[PDB]
Structure formats: C-alpha cells, structure tokens
C-alpha cells in the first residue's frame, strides 16, 4: 500500500 | 510528554529511521526524527515490532529501487496537479519514504507536516489494520472529513483524513488544539485510540 503526501 | 518519554520515543525511532547514503542535511534529518518522536510511543513501538522502516531520502522517491515502478504514475488525489510520484516528497502505507527538507506545508505538498502524515498512513495500515476504512471512522469521516480543508483530498479519502488528523494531533499543541475545535469526534477518536 502506498499513499501520497497531501497535494 | 515527559522528557524521558520523548527520549524513549527517540530511542525507538533510532531503530526505525534509515538515513540515506551520501551527503544530506543531517540537522534537518534530526529535526524530522524529533517531530516524529512526539507520536505516542505505543504506535512507534508497534512500528518497530513490525520492522517498518522510515527511510529519509536525499533525492526523489522514484530513484529508490522499491518505488521505480511508480515513475510517471499520477498518485491518488493528484489528478490535475500536473505531477507524478517522481515529484511527490512523501509516501506512506506498507512503507514510509520521505524527502529531507520537505517537511513544512508548501514544500511540494500541502500537509501540515510531511513525515507525520506519511507515518500516520503506516500506523493506520500496519499497526491499526486499516482503521481509517472501518465503519466507525467512516461515520466520523462523513461528518467531519471536510472541516480540515483540502476537501477534494482529505474530504474524499478517509485514509487521508485520518493521516492528516493524526498529524494535527501529534505535531504540536497548536495543531492539536486546532483539530479539537474543528473535528471534535475525530479528536476524541484519536484520543481513545492511544489509550
Ligand atoms: Zn496521504
């Protein structure tokens, strides 16, 4: 699972 | 958090944080660890038990072998920003990877703090078995998920609302107070989670 920083 | 507890957390993080090879900002890397040390030691010890590594990076995330497959890929919620994972400064989930120097809001991201948001994803997924997608949190998210701004990211993905709320709770007293006033149910939820 990967989740990005807030745009 | 007493000094001994903060020190205990820094010791725990000494077993989790991986620094890059080559030259990098050692002072800023230490500053990032110090901010992570305010996370409840319960979560930090669970991260260490699961051999989760918090990798601090000197370059782009996609320069790392394990993230090369993300080259050119547009992350969830980054549609229209015009960037791909190559430009994203932080990643959280099954792993944690963070660009040194990009902690603050506005450094290629709009989180209140890069490392706490990314590590919150790891705690959510690894330590708490994806509690952010539990029925309980989804009910809280439905009500309060649009009260922290960035409603087209935080207000849309419960796991992102959880991670940012977690960062607000643990970054400092100011952000902890801001969360309590904006998202009281989320604040109480996180407060009970740490017990
Ligand atoms: Zn995220």
Residue A5's closest CA among B102, B72, B181, B31? B102
Q: Which residues pair with B18 in a beta bridge?
A: B55
d(CA B195, CA B124): 16
How do strand B17-18 and strand B54-57 relate by DSSP bridges? parallel
Q: Which domain holds residue B151?
A: 1-195
d(CA B6, CA A7): 30
Residue B79, C-beta contacts closer than 8 angstroms, at least 6 positions apart: none
Contact yes or no for B38/B9 (Cβ under 8 A): yes
Q: Tally Cβ neighbours within 10 Å of residue B105.
A: 11
Flag if B95 and A2 touch (Cβ within 8 Å): yes
Identity of the residue in B93, B94, B111 whose CB atom sits nearest the CB atom of A6: B111
B66 at the A interface (CB within 8 A)? Answer: no
Flag if B94 and A1 touch (Cβ within 8 Å): yes
d(CA B34, CA B32): 5
d(CA B27, CA B33): 10
**Which long-range CB contacts under 8 A does B36-39 form with residues at least 24 apart?**
B36/B9, B36/B115, B36/B116, B36/B119, B37/B6, B37/B9, B37/B10, B37/B13, B38/B1, B38/B6, B38/B9, B38/B170, B38/B171, B38/B172, B39/B9, B39/B116, B39/B119, B39/B123, B39/B170
With tokens 């590590």, the residue in question is B119
Residue B190, C-beta contacts closer than 8 angstroms, at least 6 positions apart: B165, B166, B169
Distance from the CA of B121 to the center of ligand 1, in angstroms?
7
Count how many domains chain B has.
Answer: 1
Task: Give the resolution to one decimal, in Å.
Answer: 1.8
Contact yes or no for B17/B56 (Cβ under 8 A): yes
Experimental method: X-ray
């Amino acid at each position: 699972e990967v989740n990005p920083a807030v745009p | 958090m007493d000094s001994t507890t903060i020190q205990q957390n820094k010791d725990t993080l000494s077993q989790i944080v991986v620094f890059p090879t080559g030259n990098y900002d050692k002072n800023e890397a230490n500053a990032m660890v110090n901010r992570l040390a305010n996370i409840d030691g319960k979560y930090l010890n669970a991260l260490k038990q699961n051999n989760l590594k918090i990798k601090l990076l000197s370059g782009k995330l996609t320069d790392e072998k394990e993230y090369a497959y993300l080259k050119g890929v547009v992350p969830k919620g980054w549609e229209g920003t015009g960037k791909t994972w190559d430009d994203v400064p932080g990643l959280g989930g099954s792993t944690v990877a963070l660009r040194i120097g990009f902690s603050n809001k506005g450094k290629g991201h709009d989180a209140i703090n890069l490392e706490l948001h990314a590590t919150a994803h790891a705690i959510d997924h690894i330590v708490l078995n994806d509690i952010s997608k539990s029925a309980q949190f989804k009910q809280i998210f439905a009500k309060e998920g649009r009260s922290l701004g960035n409603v087209n990211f935080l207000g849309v993905y419960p796991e992102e609302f959880f991670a940012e709320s977690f960062a607000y709770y643990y970054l400092n007293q100011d952000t902890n107070s801001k969360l309590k006033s904006a998202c009281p149910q989320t604040y109480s939820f996180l407060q009970n989670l740490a017990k």
